[PDB]
């Protein structure tokens, strides 16, 4: 039943953070990832 | 000239998380970059203390951060899980601990230590042997 | 990506954020600092002319704010390159010190005059930016530019341009 | 990215004098940023080798 | 070779380690003569 439907932008996910003066959370494993990147460097030429 | 020459500390300007270094590859009028990034995985929470003091004399790690489980207190990376047992090497002296607002309590080993143990319990082995003549 | 918020507990090791943490009694979710900011500037036509509403509503950007505000309140810089971990702010600024290359003993022995170094810092802020009326002139030109480009396009329509009428009407 | 999510090692890049860190506040068509700087007080002369 | 160099004895932290330990090993031994 798909349709066109209008409603609110939504932010992203709320979280909350566990804060104490006491406290710290050290990470144990880790990962690699790789990205992308676009740029344009350069625009055709063109002389009249 | 930055994130492939070299390895860059500008945040977020090669690749979102912590850098490494990246490949360029062409493209037609434009150009990509391959940002390679490191990026931790799941996270544990600990109890830590900013100082601890032995004799009185506070101690702060050289480099790294104290760490307990809520049996036993060590110096870890602050981006790898490591535990180490805490030593003289490890942390350096700076004044008393009363002034500092939330020190903890613990004992501090010392390195050199143990081989003197074991020379004093070698040196003590030799004065009973002594005896003997 | 992620709307942190700070938990209502407020024992910041001596620090105050008062004045730039948002204050739930006013309607919009603004704080001290930042209403000043909403009224020292001074901010549908006839002809065509029409003015479109920004994508982000005003108390929308206000949220990023926060969000941005209270990460960096608990988590450091961490949150920005990852997963979010928390940290106590009594021992945040002993790593920012080790950037500038003193050691880390010299906070925890002076944590109570810098507390008040940085509080008291925050306080002359708010009135700097209400006294003076020269601190705002960066953002108060984008608007008079705007509106005296648009202003002046009107006042053209008025210009004989060389004929014996202006109007377009009883030419 | 660089002086609110980091402290940035730039000189006079986020604040005049030693970095630490930054707030970000709203504003009509900008922003307005709160950079804690680290400046030295009253020195002394000494003799060095 | 280097310029500007000035002369200063320096503190050695592992001599009075092995120092006292000496100084007590030294009367340990006139110790060990009484028996």
Same mark, same amino acid.
């Given at each position: 039943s798909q349709s066109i439907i209008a409603y609110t932008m939504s932010l992203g996910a709320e979280n909350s953070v566990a804060y104490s003066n006491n406290s710290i959370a050290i990470p144990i494993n880790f990962t690699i990832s790789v990205t992308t990147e676009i740029l344009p460097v350069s625009m055709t030429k063109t002389s009249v | 000239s930055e994130c492939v020459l070299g390895q860059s500390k500008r945040v977020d300007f090669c690749g979102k998380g912590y850098h490494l270094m990246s490949?360029?590859?062409?493209a037609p009028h434009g150009v990509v970059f391959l940002h390679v990034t490191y990026v931790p995985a799941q996270e544990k929470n600990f109890t830590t203390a900013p100082a601890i003091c032995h004799d009185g004399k506070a101690h702060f790690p050289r480099e790294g951060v104290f760490v307990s489980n809520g049996t036993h207190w060590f110096v870890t990376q602050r981006n790898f899980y490591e535990p180490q047992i805490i030593t003289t090497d490890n942390t350096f002296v700076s004044g008393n601990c009363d002034v500092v607002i939330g020190i903890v309590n613990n004992t501090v080993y010392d390195p050199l230590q143990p081989e003197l143990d074991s020379f004093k319990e070698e040196l003590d082995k030799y004065f009973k042997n002594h005896t003997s003549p | 990506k992620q709307i942190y918020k700070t938990p209502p507990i407020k024992d910041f090791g001596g620090f105050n954020?008062? +004045? =730039?943490?948002?204050?739930?009694?006013?309607?919009?979710?603004?704080?001290?600092?930042?209403?000043?900011?909403?009224?020292?500037?001074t901010l549908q036509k006839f002809n065509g002319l029409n003015v479109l509403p920004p994508l982000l509503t005003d108390e929308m950007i206000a949220q990023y704010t926060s969000a941005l505000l209270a990460g960096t309140?608990?988590?450091?810089?961490?949150?920005?390159?990852?997963?979010?971990? +928390? =940290?106590?702010?009594?021992?945040?600024?002993?790593y920012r010190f080790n950037g500038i290359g003193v050691t880390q003993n010299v906070l925890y022995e002076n944590q109570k005059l810098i507390a008040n170094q940085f509080n008291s810092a925050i306080g002359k802020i708010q009135d700097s930016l209400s006294s003076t009326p020269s601190a705002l002139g960066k953002l108060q030109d984008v608007v008079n530019?705007?509106?005296?480009?648009?202003?002046?396009?009107?006042?053209?329509?008025?210009?004989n341009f060389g004929a014996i009428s202006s109007v377009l009407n009883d030419i």
């Open positions: - | 490949f360029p590859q062409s | 954020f008062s +004045q =730039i943490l948002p204050d739930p009694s006013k309607p919009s979710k603004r704080s001290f600092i930042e209403d000043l900011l909403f009224n020292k500037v309140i608990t988590s450091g810089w961490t949150f920005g390159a990852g997963p979010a971990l +928390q =940290i106590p702010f009594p021992m945040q600024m002993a530019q705007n509106a005296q480009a648009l202003n002046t396009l009107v006042k053209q329509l008025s210009s």
